[PDB]
């Protein structure tokens, strides 16, 4: 149904999902100069030491490789967040041109590209529970800029040929997605919500300063992947971002000055 398209695309998301105008949706620009330093946030505690991945799959909007987070496996703690969240899938999010991608913004400026590792709060017992609360997700945002190649992502990147189109899917396992980390942990955090249908208001996002760089080949790969299913007619899978939302009654927090 939904889409990136003008036919279903963004604009018209409200008319399946009245939440795409709710009081926290997300993405948002992240004005650098009024977000709030918080000298009480703690330093965010990633251990992905652990993590397994399963599959990689172009579920139509975007390619996603999925973890088992049948234990805690994968975990992200600390910062704004009070619990344990489990990792349970990363994506990306880019576009058609270099100078835009990424959902969230940094003072209007548009990154290439915007990697999501989704988690999921584990006293809720699964996902499904997860996503009916109000901190039930959290969410790392990690910016990609072109510039050199990432070597953790090529990986990723010589899969893509084998779930060119919607519905395909492949084995990728033993993925060690610390490899995909800036240097820095510094980071601003907002209360927000999914930026793809439903929508749903349950996210704590924690979008790190540091972007990673990635090479003009890598993320032109991204380019290549298809919208569509096998036999339907070709659409490359770009631009499947949504535009930043008004913050409304939320005020973005910073870990650093
Ligand atoms: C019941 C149910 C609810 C929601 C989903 C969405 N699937 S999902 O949670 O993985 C995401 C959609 C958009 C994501 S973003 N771009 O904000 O990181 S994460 C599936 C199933
Ligand atoms: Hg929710
Ligand atoms: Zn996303």
Same mark, same amino acid.
């Given at each position: @149904? +939904? /889409?990136?398209?003008?036919?279903? %695309?963004? =604009? #018209? ?6 939440? !795409? ?71 990306? @999010? +880019? /576009?058609?041109?270099?100078?835009? %991608?990424? =959902? #969230? ?6 990154? !290439? ?56 899917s492949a084995d990728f396992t033993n993925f060690d997605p610390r490899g995909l980390l800036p240097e820095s942990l510094d ?34 790969k991204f380019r290549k992947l298809n919208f569509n299913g096998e036999g339907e007619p070709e659409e490359l899978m770009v ?19």
């Amino acid at each position: @149904h +939904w /889409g990136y398209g003008k036919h279903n %695309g963004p =604009e #018209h998301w409200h008319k399946d999902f009245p939440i !795409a105008k709710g009081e926290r949706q997300s993405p948002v620009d992240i004005d650098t100069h009024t977000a709030k330093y918080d000298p009480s946030l703690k330093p965010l505690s990633v251990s992905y030491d652990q993590a397994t991945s399963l599959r990689i799959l172009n579920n139509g909007h975007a390619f996603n490789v999925e973890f088992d987070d049948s234990q805690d496996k994968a975990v992200l703690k600390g910062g704004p967040l009070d619990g344990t969240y489990r990792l349970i899938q990363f994506h990306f @999010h +880019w /576009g058609s041109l270099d100078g835009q %991608g990424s =959902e #969230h913004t940094v003072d209007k400026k548009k990154y !290439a590209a915007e990697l999501h590792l989704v988690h999921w709060n584990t006293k809720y017992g699964d996902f499904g529970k997860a996503v009916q609360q109000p901190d039930g997700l959290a969410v790392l945002g990690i910016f990609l800029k072109v510039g050199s190649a990432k070597p953790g992502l090529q990986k990723v990147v010589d899969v893509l040929d084998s779930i060119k189109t919607k519905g395909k899917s492949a084995d990728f396992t033993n993925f060690d997605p610390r490899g995909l980390l800036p240097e820095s942990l510094d980071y601003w955090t907002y209360p927000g919500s999914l930026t793809t249908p439903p929508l749903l208001e349950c996210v704590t996002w924690i979008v790190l300063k540091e972007p990673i760089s990635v090479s003009s080949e890598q993320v032109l790969k991204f380019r290549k992947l298809n919208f569509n299913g096998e036999g339907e007619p070709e659409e490359l899978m770009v631009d499947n971002w949504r535009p930043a939302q008004p913050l409304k009654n939320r005020q973005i927090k910073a870990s650093f000055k």
